[PDB]
């Protein structure tokens, strides 16, 4: 069909490899493109870590208020919130918000450590029935995005299904689900990615990521006017280590797959 042809042409023109999974929750119809192929998640993996802490808060109502010390040695390559709290503390809620809304890599490492390591983030994914997601490394090395490296990868379809389950389905109890959605809706890094291909009237929660190999990612829950939500994963990557980030490709893919709503 013409949608598939447009995605093929977009990928061909890009020089890279495009992965798209759109789930239309009105009827669970899907638009898929390379949706069973692995892609490095980069900072999009942070949704799984934040959600795992939210799950824990179902059994400890006040867990999100618990404080975590931030030390100079904790700082990694991109720390916009954590660097302001060195030799102080952040709450787990502040760490979740920093990880998701500002893509703070130190905050992600604090979440990973809290949970018991990358393997435990993976174990949480498994508890949601996601057998595809794997987190293997901490920040910043989980963003290497090396072609053919299975570490810190998932598929667009597995991630769309999981994002749907987390934000709209039964992965989290209601208060926790609502908290995750609030965080994603407050993202500060996603206006040039999926959002840029959608009507301005639509409400969006998303989490972006980027990496080496010009890896450019975004995962989103989309609330169109007068319609059931859509869940969209757009992963993009290029064959050269130092290729530039291409958020415009994600915006273009988002526009191609969301007509008619």
Swiss-Prot record:
Further remark: The class A beta-lactamase family has a specific amino-acid numbering system, sometimes called Ambler or ABL numbering and often misspelt as Amber. A multiple sequence alignment was used to derive a consensus sequence and then the consensus was numbered taking into account insertions and deletions. This allows use of identical numbers, e.g. for active site residues, despite differences in protein length. UniProt always uses natural numbering of residues, hence there appear to be differences in numbering between this entry and some papers.
Family per similarity comment: Belongs to the class-A beta-lactamase family.
Entry keyword Nucleotide-binding: no
Species in which this protein is naturally found: Escherichia coli
GO molecular function, one term: beta-lactamase activity
Encoding gene (name): bla
Domain of life: Bacteria
Subunit structure and binding partners: Monomer.
UniProt-listed Enzyme Commission number(s): 3.5.2.6
Binding site for substrate: 207-209
Catalytic residue positions: 43 (acyl-ester intermediate)
Protein name: Beta-lactamase Toho-1
This protein's UniProt keywords: Antibiotic resistance, Hydrolase, Plasmid, Signal
Coiled coil start-end: none
One Gene Ontology biological process: response to antibiotic
Role noted for this protein: Has strong cefotaxime-hydrolyzing activity.
Catalyzed reaction equations: a beta-lactam + H2O = a substituted beta-amino acid
SUPFAM superfamilies: beta-lactamase/transpeptidase-like
